[PDB]
Design a protein around this ligand. Structure first.
Ligand code: GTP
Ligand code: GTP
Ligand code: GDP
Ligand code: MG
Ligand code: MG
Lengths: 99, 439, 426, 431
């Protein structure tokens, strides 16, 4: 069962890599003269797989899950960067005394 | 998703909407051309701009505000100035003849001509956004189109949109200086409209900002070009909880529930602190206690009234920057012990705070300094009845001798609106006095 | 097997529930990805209580997340461990409440309650033999206190013969944050005392006192405060997930702490909370645990048991121990403080032990105590409620949304008779 | 396998046709010589063995000054010379002259040449006829052309583009006289008929297009883009297509009602297109605005009973049905009680193309709306009052009587039209 799950993950990753190849080739062919109109192409390749705006889960393979639970509208959650400093859990535990 | 639409009425409205939207662009990095910086094409990009800026597939971010004024001279400087390519051409509505400091001309005759053209663009900006909390309104009391046109804008918008939020940022006339003569007539005759067709309303006094600039920021001869930066700093700190992440967020719906205890009492007062020049900011430390003390200081208050003579009704705190909530709770406690500040007896817990991580930004050529933390206070009290009593006395002695009335009665409106606004103001002042009386 | 369904209501509930699922993930050894990276084999033999199985040997928390605005669902998705939670379990809404009990209970929470009930019923019917529910919410907020009591009343009707816990965040006198929080809280405890088995009072200024004085920290952020809260939430279900010499569940602690259904408010406390520098000086020994457990500095409710007296006391211990220490020490503190204990019932202490200590720790203890000093909190908020309501304060936000003033009057009387029968047993 | 024949009458129809065929050649990539520098042109361009393409349009007129510029200009070699029928003496704004005196001399030639064009087409899809209510050639000669065409061809669809006379401005004085005796002919000899007011396009080009000084060429470019969206499904495949027989059935509830209102959106300059994002939900709102119709009447006075939608470009059917839903929730627009689902939707993939020196800009999604409305009784009741006050003391009646028609046809058209005005009044009553 574990072997099957790994095989399915590998197949999905191969399909995404083929799309990345095609997209990079098309953008490189289109940007020969000027780069003043490559913004929709760059935005489309930087959309991320799935309708999500959260950071990609790189250990999961770049998955971007979607969150649409709002009555009948179903608008996705926005994204905001945090100015708060990041913390290590071992540092937090040792500071709070669970050591 | 949490979009916010701005309504800027009058020459004051279109001038405050210039420095305010300049601060909005530099906060999100919007270039004056309209697009995001092209060098920042690195993967990511927070959706914190959709509350103020629209989206196009080209990458252009169009603001969602409308600029309305009956004077085409001051609107056309926007089409000539630096930001001629950012603003949409159809979002700036221009009249042909100004209201000329009058209520009747700006309300019944000339305001009816453009009451459809503006609201057509309002509908186009309202179906564009999915979830709209409400509209922000910038207008001045003393202006003709600020009083006359707004007094029909609020009534017809209340019918067009039922339970949307209505915040009001009003330029109140100063008690000593004055740029007009018939401004008591313009101020009194529209307070009946804003009594029943406004959810919340703040007030600013031009000479009260004048003393702040000359005493705190070490600028001897200020101009409206930096007063609008101070007002735009206030609106930015109010809405920054919606735009950016915080330890605990406050919405436009959230604070209007905590500052309006009665439908006839929706007049709190705004205060910003610290406002310190660059050469003075490097001397003093700016702690949480030393910025929340200036908000309670009546000298730093930007309305010509004293809460020491009055009594505090409710308070709202907007903290922005490197702030820890432990020091906020400590500073709140040490204010509560001092008997110089007096609270009403039936509101023992009269505080509500909000925390924001991002420090405020500055503009090139600005007079404020780069600070690590700042606070905006929205405090309600009874001390506005002092300002109401010192203005309606001047209104009563103006109207005793039937002065300037022929500039109103011949334009279409009757004369009984003067007496009914006189009687409504007397009931409002009686209402504020009865609430201030404790059991 | 007995399982716990976790409820997260409100922004406060989400920020303490994220840290709760943070802590027990390290207790069971769960990576941010979702797999298992541990050392022993006992960490996998009881994992079905908090985790549901998935494909590829993945485990997901058995929790649902409830809030009315999208502001805080982003932070529980962009957090360090936000990627473990199920994406379908997030239940949010277009319009929030904003520190309003009335909007949260009748006009905004009445539409989202259909969706979250569908989610929780779909998950709970998949359980083999469900043990009980657990709720985390705050009384000072619009969404956690408004429709959170609506969640309590709905699933009490739908699942009668069950148990539910709540970790309620009651407001503080000096760390008051909401102007209308007496309205948000008194209307909540009227709907809370009727249909709740177990209630833990967690107050913010109690956590501020512990972080400032006992732990000697300078910047106690909310990430630090939720760790103290999650130490007790992990500290109450230790014997259910780990074998011990004398196991105890939530129901076993329930039947020993409540003698009557209207006496169910408690005082959580955690015994090892020494500061970082003082750690090398203090011996970790059973009398050291039970001394700090009964200290009034370690109470997580803003009342002193000296002014009242203890009714029932629960003790849950962690770590391999010799219990001849834990019986002679609890008998000593029962005999010495005779005036602080009721005399119409003897042997007021329930003792429980657990073999497995928490990670990085050798010895631990958890306190759940019922007393009469909780009335000090109830009288303190009732006097502010009475001093506010008599002049019709802030009432247009409340009476204009459907409900009448008789709901205020009956919330006065039900809370007054509740503290009256608290005084009758004192 | 599908073929359409274009018929242009009058000076307005010729000038519209030149602007239309400029758009058509640039859309299909046709040089003005007629040869390309894969078979979508078969409905409009006949095939020659050398590689040339000949249009299937007949330009007719009764004054040589309009056809002469066609035979002289850039497309002098593209058009077949037998397709440009030219008379000798024009009717000169007289319906009676164009119906009873002049039109019978060339009615043999145009009916012979339409047979040669119909011979080459294996299956006829529809006759497009461009005509004007005002001028004599577009009123008189057009009237007996359909009377001959109704018995020559039985059930073949004859779609119509009328030039409805303006309510407030005018080219002619006798243009209400011309625009009434043709309504009798177009009741029983027209399948579908769209209409236009000139100053409405004048208002659109002045306000939306930032052109303070337009010409008839600028109007004819906007008219040609309205024409192209109808035949776009005929010439290009889409997610779901619409044919000429398709939308003509779903918009007429009775044979006496075949007069809908077209409305194009978005109309925008290349300056404002850089500012505004044009989504399908944002372009469908402009079809309901009272300021943005091409017709000078407000549908808020009336009520809708049939609507047709033509989406072209990068369009998604989900956002179409989402935008249709939210318009139905709006209570400003009203529908009749006897037709709950009055919508018809057409989808095309190809974006609309633009000509150099034109007014509009390149757009990625556009919409054309064909809505039947009760409010055309508003404009007719305005024009009925103008007719009978002119006819109260018999103005200009000596000109029409002396041509050869009897004097009773004026009152015959009045008692006809009063019945049709009563007909539209009782359609809009609720049950
Ligand atoms: N604080 C502040 N007030 C301003 C500013 N600009 C104009 N005002 C106020 O506007 C008042 C005068 O009315 P205006 O806004 O200039 O003109 P208006 O609203 O078009 O009304 P009319 O004079 O009748 O045309 C003055 O009393 C000022 O208080 C500004 O930049 N900052
Ligand atoms: N909408 C529109 N109408 C036009 C245009 N050009 C002419 N017309 C209409 O045509 C009417 C007059 O007829 P003309 O086009 O000049 O020529 P005609 O139809 O052959 O009539 P005669 O000159 O009498 O032979 C006017 O009332 C206009 O309304 C145009 O470019 N657009
Ligand atoms: N102990 C603790 N209290 C919190 C935390 N976050 C918020 N609070 C408290 O909860 C109150 C705000 O709750 P609120 O967001 O309005 O609840 P909601 O309306 O249900 O979302 C504040 O007064 C805080 O003191 C936390 O992480 N830990
Ligand atoms: Mg003006
Ligand atoms: Mg002609």
């Amino acid at each position: 069962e574990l072997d099957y799950c790994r095989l399915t993950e590998a197949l999905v990753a191969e399909k995404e890599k083929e799309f990345q190849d095609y997209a990079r080739e098309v953008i490189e062919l289109e940007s020969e003269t000027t780069n003043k109109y490559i913004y929709p192409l760059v935005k489309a390749v930087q959309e991320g797989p799935g309708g999500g705006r959260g950071p990609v889960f790189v250990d999961r393979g770049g998955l971007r899950p979607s969150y649409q639970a709002n009555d009948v509208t179903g608008v996705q959650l926005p994204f905001y960067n945090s100015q708060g400093p990041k913390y290590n859990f071992q540092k937090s535990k040792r500071r709070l005394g669970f050591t | 998703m949490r979009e916010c639409i701005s309504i800027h009425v009058g020459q004051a409205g279109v001038q405050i909407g210039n420095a305010c939207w300049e601060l909005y662009c530099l906060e999100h990095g919007i270039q004056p051309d309209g697009q995001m910086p092209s060098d920042k094409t690195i993967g990511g990009g927070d959706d914190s701009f959709n509350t103020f800026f629209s989206e196009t597939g080209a990458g252009k971010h169009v603001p969602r505000a409308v600029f309305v004024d009956l004077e085409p001279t001051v609107i056309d400087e926007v089409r000539t100035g630096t930001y001629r390519q950012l603003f949409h051409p159809e979002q700036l509505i221009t009249g042909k003849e100004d209201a000329a400091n009058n209520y009747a001309r700006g309300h019944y005759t000339i305001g009816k001509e453009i009451i459809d053209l503006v609201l057509d663009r309002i509908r186009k900006l309202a179906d564009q956004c999915t979830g709209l909390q409400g509209f922000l309104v910038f207008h001045s009391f003393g202006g003709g189109t600020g009083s006359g046109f707004t007094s029909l804008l609020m009534e017809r918008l209340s019918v067009d949109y039922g339970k949307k939020s209505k915040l009001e940022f009003s330029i109140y006339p100063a008690p000593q200086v004055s740029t007009a003569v018939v401004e008591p007539y313009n101020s009194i005759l529209t307070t009946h409209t804003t009594l029943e067709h406004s959810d919340c309303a703040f007030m600013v006094d031009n000479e009260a900002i004048y003393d702040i600039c000359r005493r705190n920021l070490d600028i001897e001869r200020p101009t409206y070009t930096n007063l609008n930066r101070l007002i735009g700093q206030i609106v930015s700190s109010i809405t920054a909880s919606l735009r950016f992440d915080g330890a605990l967020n406050v919405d436009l719906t959230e604070f209007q529930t905590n500052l309006v205890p009665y439908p006839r009492i929706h007049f709190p007062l705004a205060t910003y602190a610290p406002v310190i020049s660059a050469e003075k900011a490097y001397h003093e430390q700016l702690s949480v206690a030393e910025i929340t003390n200036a908000c309670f200081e009546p000298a730093n208050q930007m309305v010509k009234c004293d809460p020491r003579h009055g009594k505090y009704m409710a308070c709202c705190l907007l903290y922005r920057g490197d702030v820890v909530p432990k020091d906020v709770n400590a500073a709140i406690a040490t204010i509560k012990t001092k008997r110089t500040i007096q609270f009403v007896d039936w509101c023992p817990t009269g505080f509500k705070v909000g925390i924001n991580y991002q420090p405020p930004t500055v503009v090139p050529g600005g007079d404020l300094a780069k600070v690590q933390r700042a606070v905006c206070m929205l405090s309600n009290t009874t001390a506005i009845a002092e300002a109401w009593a010192r203005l309606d006395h001047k209104f009563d002695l103006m109207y005793a001798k039937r002065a300037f009335v022929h500039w109103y009665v011949g334009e279409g409106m009757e004369e009984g609106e003067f007496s009914e606004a006189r009687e409504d103001m007397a009931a409002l002042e009686k209402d504020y006095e009865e609430v201030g009386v404790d059991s | 097997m007995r399982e716990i369904v976790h409820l997260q209501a409100g922004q406060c509930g989400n920020q303490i529930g994220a840290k709760f699922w943070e802590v027990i993930s390290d207790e069971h050894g769960i990576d941010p990805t979702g797999t298992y990276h541990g050392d022993s084999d006992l960490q996998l033999e009881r994992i079905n209580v908090y985790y549901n199985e998935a494909t590829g040997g993945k485990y997901v928390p058995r929790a649902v997340l409830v809030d009315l605005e999208p502001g805080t669902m982003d932070s529980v998705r962009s957090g360090p461990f936000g990627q473990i939670f199920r994406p379908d379990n997030f239940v949010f809404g277009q319009s929030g409440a904003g520190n309003n009990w009335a909007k949260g209970h009748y006009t905004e929470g009445a539409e989202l309650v259909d969706s979250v009930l569908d989610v929780v019923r779909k998950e709970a019917e998949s359980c083999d033999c469900l043990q009980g529910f657990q709720l985390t919410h705050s009384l000072g907020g619009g969404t956690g206190s408004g429709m959170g009591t609506l969640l309590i009343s709905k699933i009490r009707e739908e699942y009668p013969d069950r148990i539910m816990n709540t970790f309620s965040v009651v407001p503080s006198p000096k760390v008051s944050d909401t102007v209308v929080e007496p309205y948000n809280a008194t209307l909540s405890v009227h709907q809370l005392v009727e249909n709740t088995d177990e209630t833990y009072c967690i107050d913010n200024e109690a956590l501020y006192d512990i972080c400032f004085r006992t732990l000697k920290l300078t910047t106690p952020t909310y990430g630090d405060l939720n760790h103290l809260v999650s130490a007790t939430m992990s500290g109450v279900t230790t014997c259910l997930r780990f074998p011990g010499q004398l196991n105890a569940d939530l129901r076993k602690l329930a039947v020993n702490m409540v003698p009557f259904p209207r006496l169910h408010f408690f005082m959580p406390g955690f015994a090892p909370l020494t500061s970082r520098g003082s750690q090398q000086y203090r011996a970790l020994t059973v009398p050291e645990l039970t001394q700090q457990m009964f200290d009034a500095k370690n109470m997580m409710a803003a009342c002193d048991p000296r002014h009242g007296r203890y009714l029932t006391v629960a003790a849950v211990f962690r770590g391999r121990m010799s219990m001849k220490e834990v019986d002679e020490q609890m008998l000593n503190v029962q005999n010495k403080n005779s005036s602080y204990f009721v005399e119409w019932i003897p042997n007021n202490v329930k003792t429980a032990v657990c073999d497995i200590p928490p990670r990085g720790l050798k010895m631990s203890a958890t306190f759940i105590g019922n007393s009469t000093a909780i009335q000090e909190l109830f009288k303190r908020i009732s006097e502010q409620f009475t001093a506010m309501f008599r002049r019709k304060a802030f009432l247009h936000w409340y009476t204009g949304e459907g409900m009448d003033e008789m709901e205020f009057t009956e919330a006065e009387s039900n809370m007054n008779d509740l503290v009256s029968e608290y005084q009758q047993y004192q």
